Amino acid sequence: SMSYTWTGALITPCAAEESKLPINPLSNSLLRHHNMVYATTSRSASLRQKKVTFDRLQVLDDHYRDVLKEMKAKASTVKAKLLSIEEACKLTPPHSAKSKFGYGAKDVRNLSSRAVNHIRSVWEDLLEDTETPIDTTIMAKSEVFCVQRKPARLIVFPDLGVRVCEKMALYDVVSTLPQAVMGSSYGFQYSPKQRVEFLVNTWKSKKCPMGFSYDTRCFDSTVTESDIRVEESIYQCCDLAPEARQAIRSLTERLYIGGPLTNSKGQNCGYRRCRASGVLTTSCGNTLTCYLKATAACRAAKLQDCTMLVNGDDLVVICESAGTQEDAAALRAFTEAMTRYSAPPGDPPQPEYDLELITSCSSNVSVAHDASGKRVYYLTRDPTTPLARAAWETARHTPINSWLGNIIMYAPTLWARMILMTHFFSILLAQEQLGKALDCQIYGACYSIEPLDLPQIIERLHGLSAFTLHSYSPGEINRVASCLRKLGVPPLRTWRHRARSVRAKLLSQGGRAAICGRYLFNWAVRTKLKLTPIPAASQLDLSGWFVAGYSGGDIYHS
């Protein structure tokens, strides 16, 4: 069946669409080549539609069924709970898209009559109606990139009331199930530090390691009605409340397998027969599905001792090498099996024999040394996208601050410390907004974070070594340097100068600002101050942080 079918109507915006980076004084300080930074618009929707629209031919086999049974036996041990309206309401972002039924995210959050009554009425319709397709809105996403142009991403999502009903029935499932089914292979149970720990141990545990990253072209579109039903069958293995069991059953047929696409004008856009990106089960469902297809493809291909790390469609395999000629063949056999399971490659996979050469979750493993000269492993990535997005956030007030998430997640990196910390700490201080909370996403979930809380947050996630790292690899230094030239970002010596300036100002303020100068900017000065465990880091409530993925699940923690 076709992934999509269209009516001819256009994917429309609900407002004016900015695509060009503004010539702004503050963003210009970070990036000069403004014409190389763009945001995607609905003007590219058609190129994405051509790329995502195709017919799927799936052929499941003995290896696929064996693994599915192994996965169900593990799912059998889970006892999932049904969240109340109030608990489900509390997990709604304050700026989540309002309902088409005269209420919004703030009404949901405050548990207002119009909101609570409508959610209850949607819940009963899921218990009573097991057939009628649920309506979704199709929108082109607005994301920022650097040139060399990408076409817009298509986002599919149901109404507010429905989204609160998915939380009541599925939130605890998507939170505890993947870890019970997959174990150490579920990448969302880890922080960045724990992620390096697992990749290094897995690599070092093999006698002769071989690794590869497998890229699926338009994974959401490769997902069939069969894959979605097989997914519900893993969910049914949970101990469930009668109403939750019915809601999962109804949501699977009416929403998860396919449904009507409606544009912002209210016109009919077409029909979806694959994965909606704006649902609660997108993260969990894609992880399980990618893990099932890959695990069975390893057996079919005769690849030895497979250890895998899955985060939705992002998959990395670390196995036992059988030699060059053997490895090449087995990797093609793996691809052959994935194509049959309806997961063909975007860019063909390559056998790697050095961990640092593999890219998984846009990241790669790299080495730097601590204050005591000992080797420290950390996750990095190419800084182009994070820098182009930080420039946009400087000129325009965005709902989610990617720059803040990049600081937290990539805190030990050369680029987050020197550029991202310096740029924002200068601007915020000059505006008296260092203690003003900001929204960011960690693993799809929304968090309200004060920039001044960063030293404690980094010490917990990355240890004190995040504030002492030096002697970065030549490769890492070359990548940072060539990117700065490309985007027209000032050299590292200008950043070192700018850092010295903020550090002083932060130190004279005292309180939490002095903690920021001492820890975050100790790299910028030769007379290094004494760095000890911050009292506040000991009692940080970092639960809920690295548990599960919630991309498109409309989730708000804190």
Ligand X SMILES: O=C(O)c1c(-c2ccccc2F)c2cc(Cl)ccc2n1Cc1ccccc1
Annotated binding site: 215, 313-314
Q: How far apart are CA 320 and CA 227, in angstroms?
A: 29
- AA letter at 362: S
Nearer to ligand X, 195 or 503 (CB): 195
406, 413, 456, 468: which one contacts ligand X (CB under 6 A)? 406
Residue type, 318: I
| Selected range binding ligand X among 22-30, 364-372, 405-413, 528-536, rule: CB under 6 A | 405-413
Q: DSSP code of 150?
A: P
Considering only the stretches 127-135, 233-241, 307-315, 452-460, report the one whose residues sit in contact with ligand X under the rule CB under 6 A. 307-315
Stretch that binds ligand X, among 91-99, 245-253, 285-293, 359-367 (CB under 6 A): 359-367
Query: Rounded distance, CA 44 to CA 285, Å?
Result: 28
- State the nearest-atom distance from the C-beta of 175 to ligand X, in Å: 15
Q: Which is nearer to ligand X, 385 or 433 (CB)?
A: 385
Residue numbers belonging to the annotated binding site for Mg(2+)? 215, 313-314
- Of 34-42, 59-67, 356-364, 540-548, the window that binds ligand X (rule: CB under 6 A) is 356-364
Question: Breaks in the chain follow which residues, C to N over 2.5 Å?
Answer: 148
Q: Interface with ligand X includes 405 (CB under 6 A)?
A: yes
d(CA 398, CA 395): 9
How near is the Cβ of 499 to ligand X at its closest, in Å? 22
**Would you say 92 or 311 has its CB closer to ligand X?**
311
For the CB of residue 401, give the shortest distance to ligand X in the complex, in Å: 10
Q: Are 380 and 194 in contact (CB under 8 A)?
A: no
| 400 binding ligand X? (CB under 6 A) | no
Q: Which of residues 424-453 bind ligand X (CB under 6 A)?
A: 441-444
Among 189, 250, 311, 465, interactor with ligand X by CB under 6 A = 311
In the complex with ligand X, the residue whose CB is nearer, 96 or 363, is: 363
CB of 82 vs ligand X, minimal distance in Å = 27
Quick one: which of 470, 483, 454, 516 has its CA closest to 378? 470
Give the C-alpha distances (Å, rounded to integers) separating 478 from 466, 485, 496: 21, 11, 17
Least distance (Å) from ligand X to the CB of residue 462? 10
Choose between 192 and 270: whose C-beta lies nearer to ligand X: 192
Contact 254, 131 (CB under 8 A): yes
Q: Kindly state the number of chain residues that form the binding site for ligand X, as judged by CB under 6 A.
A: 16
Query: Nearest approach, Cβ of 282 to ligand X (angstroms)?
Result: 12
Q: Which of 518, 552, 532, 448 is nearest to 219 (CA)?
A: 552
Of 93-101, 226-234, 361-369, 499-507, the window that binds ligand X (rule: CB under 6 A) is 361-369
- Smallest gap from Cβ 360 to ligand X, in A, equals 8
285 lies in the site for ligand X, by CB under 6 A: no
Nearer to ligand X, 192 or 209 (CB): 192
Q: Which parts of 25-81 are beta strand (E)?
A: 37-39
CA-closest candidate to residue 136, choices 8, 4, 46, 249: 4
Closest to ligand X by CB, 137 vs 406, is 406
Q: Does 289 bind ligand X (CB under 6 A)?
A: no
Determine whether 416 is exposed, middle or buried from the number of CB atoms within 10 Å of its CB (0-12, 13-18, 19+). Answer: buried
Distances (CA, A) of 547 to 2, 78, 166, 249: 34, 15, 19, 25
CB of 267 to ligand X, least distance (A): 33
Q: By Cβ distance, which residue is nearest to ligand X?
A: 405
CA distances from 400 to 127, 385, 489 (A): 35, 15, 23
What are 115's two structure tokens? 């909101």
Q: Does 312 bind ligand X (CB under 6 A)?
A: yes
From 235-243, 309-317, 339-347, 348-356, give the range in contact with ligand X by CB under 6 A: 309-317
Q: How far apart are CA 324 and CA 305, in angstroms?
A: 16
Site string for ligand X, 174-213 (x = CB under 6 A): ------------------x--x------------------
Q: Cα separations (Å) of 340 from 70, 287, 303, 458?
A: 21, 18, 17, 44
CB of 375 to ligand X, least distance (A): 18
Q: Which residue among 223, 319, 379, 421 contacts ligand X (CB under 6 A)?
A: 379
Is residue 314 packed enough to be buried (19+ CB in 10 Å), middle (13-18) or exposed (0-12)? buried
Q: Which is nearer to ligand X, 99 or 175 (CB)?
A: 175
Beta bridge partners of 311: 314
* Subset of 470-509 contacting ligand X (CB under 6 A): none
Toward ligand X, which CB reaches closer, 238 or 379?
A: 379
Sign, CA torsion 347/351/354/360: positive
Residue 309: CB minimum distance to ligand X, A:
10
Closest CA to 193 of 554, 500, 460: 460
**Considering all CA atoms of the chain, what is the largest pairwise distance in Å, rounded to the nearest integer?**
70
Question: Which of 1, 84, 362, 478 is in the footprint of ligand X by CB under 6 A?
Answer: 362
Rounded Cα–Cα distance for residues 318 and 379 (Å): 17
- Site residues (CB under 6 A) for ligand X? 192, 195, 311-312, 314, 361-363, 379, 405-406, 409, 441-444
